[PDB]
Design a protein around this ligand. Sequence first.
Ligand SMILES: *[C@@H]1O[C@H](CO)[C@@H](O[C@@H]2O[C@H](CO)[C@@H](O)[C@H](O)[C@H]2NC(C)=O)[C@H](O)[C@H]1NC(C)=O
Ligand SMILES: *[C@@H]1O[C@H](CO)[C@@H](O[C@@H]2O[C@H](CO)[C@@H](O)[C@H](O)[C@H]2NC(C)=O)[C@H](O)[C@H]1NC(C)=O
Ligand SMILES: *[C@@H]1O[C@H](CO)[C@@H](O[C@@H]2O[C@H](CO)[C@@H](O)[C@H](O)[C@H]2NC(C)=O)[C@H](O)[C@H]1NC(C)=O
Ligand SMILES: *[C@@H]1O[C@H](CO)[C@@H](O[C@@H]2O[C@H](CO)[C@@H](O)[C@H](O)[C@H]2NC(C)=O)[C@H](O)[C@H]1NC(C)=O
Ligand SMILES: *[C@@H]1O[C@H](CO)[C@@H](O)[C@H](O)[C@H]1NC(C)=O
Lengths: 106, 49, 96, 50
Amino acid sequence: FCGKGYHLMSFPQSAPHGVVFLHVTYVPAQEKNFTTAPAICHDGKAHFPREGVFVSNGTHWFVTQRNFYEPQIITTDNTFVSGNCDVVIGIVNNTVYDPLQPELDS
Amino acid sequence: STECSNLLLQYGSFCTQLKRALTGIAVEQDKNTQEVFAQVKQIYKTPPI
Amino acid sequence: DLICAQKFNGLTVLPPLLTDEMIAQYTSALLAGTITSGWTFGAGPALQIPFPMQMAYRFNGIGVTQNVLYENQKLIANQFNSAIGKIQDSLSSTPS
Amino acid sequence: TMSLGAENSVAYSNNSIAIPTNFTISVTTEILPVSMTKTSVDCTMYICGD
Ligand SMILES: *[C@@H]1O[C@H](CO)[C@@H](O[C@@H]2O[C@H](CO)[C@@H](O)[C@H](O)[C@H]2NC(C)=O)[C@H](O)[C@H]1NC(C)=O
Ligand SMILES: *[C@@H]1O[C@H](CO)[C@@H](O[C@@H]2O[C@H](CO)[C@@H](O)[C@H](O)[C@H]2NC(C)=O)[C@H](O)[C@H]1NC(C)=O
Ligand SMILES: *[C@@H]1O[C@H](CO)[C@@H](O[C@@H]2O[C@H](CO)[C@@H](O)[C@H](O)[C@H]2NC(C)=O)[C@H](O)[C@H]1NC(C)=O
Ligand SMILES: *[C@@H]1O[C@H](CO)[C@@H](O[C@@H]2O[C@H](CO)[C@@H](O)[C@H](O)[C@H]2NC(C)=O)[C@H](O)[C@H]1NC(C)=O
Ligand SMILES: *[C@@H]1O[C@H](CO)[C@@H](O)[C@H](O)[C@H]1NC(C)=O
């Protein structure tokens, strides 16, 4: 409706018998392949991303926002738990970090 | 009839107006098909499986 | 003989610029981009995504968590397939 | 025969995703007519003059 791409904002310009809209949009670029999974199996629990998606560059599993590659460590703060690992098709085994664990480990 | 066309010439540019309006409608239909269906410039393919 | 009677009096029908197979090829391209890439092909380059994960994104778009889909993936797929079959039956069985 | 576009087979599989690593801020134009030329006709002067 407001240009090709994800619309950010727009500018009106007057024209003889008309209007010209300058649509400023966000276009994704320089995409990269990653191995993805629907959920992470950790301690018999299924973890799902709170706002992003699980990606893997080949060796390590991360969670990133969907429209821009920003890999982050899969923690309990950006994932939520629903059920065990027996139901989700395609769930992979990976560790999920707990920030309370180094505090109580020392 | 040639003399009927000679009498039709005295009515002015009515036939030119009707032909121009119908040509506008005819190109408008193709434009409508372009706006509805030609929304991608890449012809994507389904994988074989 | 209606078409010949129209043609003989100066009333001609111009063909459409796009044939039916080219419009069908446009719709096949739209289907392939939507199934293989989601909404990403409409906003830029087509980024591939698995269709259960795309449909989980769409559940997240309507305010339902992803685990509702991932725990019920077979049920959602069966309901979708039955609904498509019901579209084909309802279109074949209705004149209006 | 006119070409519909370039063929682009999207590399679909059930465990692969494509994530963008960059972006382009794209500005495009959309031109929309708003008004016409406002015309008035004196019907008697057009048909008959004086
Ligand atoms: C995927 O990304 C991770 C993190 O960006 C990489 O892990 C690091 O790789 C470098 C280079 O081998 C090592 O020096 C670091 O010690 C690694 N970090 C950890 C925590 O082990 C990983 O190598 C990447 N994998 C691929 C295939 O690119
Ligand atoms: C992820 O880990 C679980 C258990 O931690 C694995 O499930 C086991 O798989 C073996 C091999 O099939 C079975 O003998 C065990 O009985 C399973 N245990 C349970 C509790 O289910 C699972 O295979 C791992 N997934 C991957 C991809 O390695
Ligand atoms: C992700 O990987 C796939 C292959 O698994 C790449 O798809 C291939 O791309 C090349 C170059 O355009 C084509 O010649 C092949 O025919 C493609 N294969 C298939 C199966 O479609 C894809 O390009 C990769 N994505 C990125 C961003 O590099
Ligand atoms: C993201 O894209 C921008 C351009 O779209 C990149 O910026 C260019 O970077 C190269 C090399 O550093 C320079 O030669 C160009 O002059 C830059 N262009 C502009 C407009 O700044 C940027 O490097 C890209 N970032 C990543 C991480 O790929
Ligand atoms: C993905 O598909 C391949 C072959 O089509 C199959 O071997 C694999 O098990 C599938 N994985 C999932 C999670 O469906």
